[PDB]
Design a protein around this ligand. Structure first.
Ligand SMILES: CS(=O)(=O)NCCc1ccccc1
Ligand SMILES: [Zn+2]
Ligand SMILES: [Zn+2]
Ligand SMILES: [Zn+2]
Length: 572
């Protein structure tokens, strides 16, 4: 019951028993909380409650110190002191934003805005509260019990009456019951056991409810600027491949942390792995939130870094398959490739955090907690997709509120900008350069003359809330017969249910915009499906069209984004 004040540090006995995290609040700060919020339960060694038998007054504003104990106005002795007076709550050693964070339900963008404009101590209170709220919300969904098993990859589900049914995307990972984790895709649902098992009738699935550990470390260790490359030892024999990155590699060494904004295809992986070659004796930990992101950095390491000095860290509760050409779970290899969730307690000369738009402030804190490093490098792009906010239903989360790194990148700019797209036909580079990159992104490739747009609103049907547009798929089917080179195309849409239908009708491989991020394909076919804020999100749109190396066909619903595409228009 003795801790530091989660605003001003001042030690106290006082936590808030109304906050769902139970933060330590100093007397001066615990007052400003309880007199401005529905939050009236103060905890100490024992709860500030009325000690009078049978009395249920718990509100600190209605309570007095009666010698040693606490009483309401109905029970206090003559010589009694109000617990709340003179801007303070009585305690040992004797904030608007804190109040908003403490009380918000996290369904409003403004909640996320505040949690990124506040002080650093509040960003950690914010991130813990939010994750706690996210996890305790999970308990409010209905159970899914197997009616009938059709095949090895399809089944029929019976749902609990009285409680809502959650959306069946890959995002929402269920646990079967302890028969391992399972995901679904929509009267025929596709079932994918992360662990293989001849699915039983009667068996049930419930959502992975994980306990929110406290945070300790800041999102961002305080900045240090050095006059000289600190704690790292450079070569004077650096492969010409990486000669472009050398001045930025020296910036990495002359600062505590650094931020790299690389638009799609500008050589982020190449910069990350090139940093190892420039500082060849430096121990580097390569981390990102997703397995795919860490598996990209592993592929790029395989090509340039000695395979004997590389480990892929795999958590024993292994969900999806990942990189297999490194030594698995050797914490002490010079090069360690690990998702945030799975990072060991260790130290490093450099930490590289990739796909930083996908990072939460919680993730930015856990990294600073598990890795003590001389230098932190934050790589990604705030013009790309953030981590989904399952509670956020009102307002759009701007890039400058994704996390502390994106906030820095969007205010003071990034330390380093990769300014040349080497992946995309110039039509795509010119479009996204203007849309999200303030015309700073340059094309290396020529116009492909294989980038097409078609304005076709079609007809929008919903599988619950996931959108489908059969006519936009039909137009794609017509196009494919006349453009057989596109038969190898990846189909991409903002909606699982659209992808589900496009899979059956077109037979192309299928990807949501959000799962496409980090990947590249020669040809892409994008159907926008709807004109919602989801499908018109400039960040989603940027990722969608920058997956293509050669060609893209965009069937558009939105005039604005359609007109902005510097592509050749088609007809029909
Ligand atoms: C109240 S809490 O449990 O959410 N933790 C407050 C966040 C914080 C932790 C340690 C140091 C600085 C800030
Ligand atoms: Zn509170
Ligand atoms: Zn305080
Ligand atoms: Zn009482």
């Amino acid at each position: 019951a003795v801790g530091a004040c989660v605003l001003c540090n001042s030690q106290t006995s006082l936590r808030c028993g109304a906050c769902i995290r139970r933060p330590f609040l100093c007397c001066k700060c615990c007052y400003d909380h309880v007199i401005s919020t529905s939050h009236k339960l103060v905890l100490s060694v024992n709860p500030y409650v009325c000690n009078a038998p049978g009395c249920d007054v718990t509100d600190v504003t209605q309570l007095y110190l009666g010698g040693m104990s606490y009483y309401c106005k109905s029970h206090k002795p003559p010589i009694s002191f109000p617990l709340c007076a003179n801007g303070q709550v009585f305690g040992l050693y004797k904030v608007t934003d804190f109040n908003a964070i403490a009380t918000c339900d996290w369904t409003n963008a403004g909640d996320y805005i505040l949690a990124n404009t506040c002080t650093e101590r509040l960003k950690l209170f914010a991130a813990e509260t939010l994750k706690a709220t996210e996890e305790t919300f999970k308990l409010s969904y209905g159970i899914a019990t197997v009616r009938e098993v059709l095949s090895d990859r399809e089944l029929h589900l019976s749902w609990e009456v009285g409680k809502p049914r959650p959306p069946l995307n890959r995002n929402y990972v269920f646990t079967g019951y302890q028969i391992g984790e399972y995901t679904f895709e929509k009267d025929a649902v596709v079932y994918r056991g992360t662990t293989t098992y001849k699915l039983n009738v009667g068996d049930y699935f419930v959502l992975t409810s994980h306990t929110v550990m406290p945070l300790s470390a800041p999102t961002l260790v305080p900045q240090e600027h050095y006059v000289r490359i600190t704690g790292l030892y450079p070569t004077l024999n650096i492969s010409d491949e990486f000669s472009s990155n050398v001045a930025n590699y020296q910036k990495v060494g002359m600062q505590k942390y650094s931020t790299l904004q690389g638009p799609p295809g500008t050589g982020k992986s190449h910069f990350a792995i090139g940093l190892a070659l420039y500082y060849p004796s430096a121990r580097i930990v390569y981390t990102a939130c997703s397995h795919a992101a860490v598996d990209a950095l592993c592929e790029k390491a395989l090509k340039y870094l000695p395979i004997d000095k590389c480990s892929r860290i795999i958590p024993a509760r292994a969900r999806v398959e990942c990189f297999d050409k490194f030594k698995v779970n050797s914490t002490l290899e010079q090069y360690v490739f690990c998702t945030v969730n799975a990072l060991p307690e260790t130290t490093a000369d450099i930490v590289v955090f990739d796909e930083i738009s996908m990072a939460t402030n919680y993730d930015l804190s856990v990294v600073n907690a598990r890795l003590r490093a001389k230098h932190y490098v934050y790589i990604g792009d705030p013009a790309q997709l953030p981590a989904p906010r399952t509670l956020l239903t009102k307002g759009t989360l701007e890039p400058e509120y994704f996390n502390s790194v994106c906030r820095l990148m969007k205010t003071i700019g990034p330390d380093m900008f990769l300014g040349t797209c080497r992946r995309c036909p110039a039509e795509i580079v010119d479009t996204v350069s203007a849309l999200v990159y303030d015309n700073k992104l340059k094309a290396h490739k020529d116009k492909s003359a294989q980038c097409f747009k078609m304005f076709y609103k079609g007809v929008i049907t919903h599988d619950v809330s996931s959108a489908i547009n059969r006519p936009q798929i039909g137009v794609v089917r017509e196009f494919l017969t006349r453009n057989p080179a596109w038969r190898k195309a990846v189909f991409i849409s903002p909606y699982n249910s659209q992808n589900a239908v496009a899979s059956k009708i077109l037979g192309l491989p299928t990807q949501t915009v959000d799962s496409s991020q980090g990947s590249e394909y020669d040809y892409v076919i994008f159907t926008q499906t709807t004109e919602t804020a989801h499908s018109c999100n400039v960040n989603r749109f940027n990722v969608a069209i920058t997956r293509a190396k050669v060609g893209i066909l965009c069937i558009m619903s939105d005039r604005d984004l359609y007109d902005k595409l510097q592509f050749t228009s088609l007809e029909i």
